């Protein structure tokens, strides 16, 4: 189970607990440029996806920044950071600053990724704090939901999962 806490309050997820091997549905997301992109546009290469409620939340610094920076060096992998619409959350791309390969995404506009990966928080209506790695067909090769959204996962584990493919 992929239930989480946010600020020390438990909160439920809508479409729950994707896991390794479960495959990814194909939904749509928006870019930082507000263009429609789908999972099918990511397919054809190994892909890495961080998910955060906002970037103002400081989780930028502690892990997402670093994880993305490492991810971008494993190889030519796609790297993404999905955020809420929330104004605090796309301006500044703490994950996508200095690593031009990273792009910030705005799923909350359509919630399609939110529902499809079950990271839409039922109680809070935010993107969950989560991290995923996908094979070239879009098959999830890592998934994690951080037990507290204001906290961060061990980021080596998705890096190893990505290494295991890229190599």
UniProtKB/Swiss-Prot annotation:
Belongs to the peroxiredoxin family. Tpx subfamily. The active site is a conserved redox-active cysteine residue, the peroxidatic cysteine (C(P)), which makes the nucleophilic attack on the peroxide substrate. The peroxide oxidizes the C(P)-SH to cysteine sulfenic acid (C(P)-SOH), which then reacts with another cysteine residue, the resolving cysteine (C(R)), to form a disulfide bridge. The disulfide is subsequently reduced by an appropriate electron donor to complete the catalytic cycle. In this atypical 2-Cys peroxiredoxin, C(R) is present in the same subunit to form an intramolecular disulfide. Thiol-specific peroxidase that catalyzes the reduction of hydrogen peroxide and organic hydroperoxides to water and alcohols, respectively. Plays a role in cell protection against oxidative stress by detoxifying peroxides. It comes from the Bacteria. The gene is tpx. Its EC number is 1.11.1.24. The keyword Oxidoreductase applies. Residues 18-167 form the Thioredoxin domain. This is Thiol peroxidase. Induction: By superoxide. The lineage of its organism: Bacteria, Bacillati, Bacillota, Bacilli, Bacillales. Homodimer. InterPro entries: Redoxin (IPR013740), Thioredoxin-like_sf (IPR036249), Thioredoxin_domain (IPR013766), TPX (IPR002065), Tpx_CS (IPR018219), Tpx_Peroxidase_subfamily (IPR050455). Coiled coil: none annotated. It catalyses: a hydroperoxide + [thioredoxin]-dithiol = an alcohol + [thioredoxin]-disulfide + H2O.
């Amino acid at each position: 189970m992929a239930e989480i806490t946010f600020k020390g309050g438990p909160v439920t997820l809508v479409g729950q607990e994707v896991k390794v091997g479960d495959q990814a549905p194909d939904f749509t997301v928006l870019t930082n440029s507000l263009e429609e992109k789908s999972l099918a546009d990511m397919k054809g290469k190994v892909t890495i996806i961080s998910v955060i409620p906002s970037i103002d939340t400081g989780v930028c610094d502690a892990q997402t920044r670093r994880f993305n920076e490492e991810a971008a060096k494993l190889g030519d992998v796609n790297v993404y950071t999905i955020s809420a619409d929330l104004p605090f959350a796309q301006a500044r791309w703490c994950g996508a600053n200095g690593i031009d390969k990273v792009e910030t995404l705005s799923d909350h506009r359509d919630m399609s990724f939110g529902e499809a990966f079950g990271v839409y928080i039922k109680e809070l209506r935010l993107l969950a704090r989560s991290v995923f790695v996908l094979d070239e067909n879009g098959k999830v090769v890592y998934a994690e939901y951080v037990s507290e959204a204001t906290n961060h996962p061990n980021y080596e584990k998705p890096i190893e999962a990505a290494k295991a493919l890229v190599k």
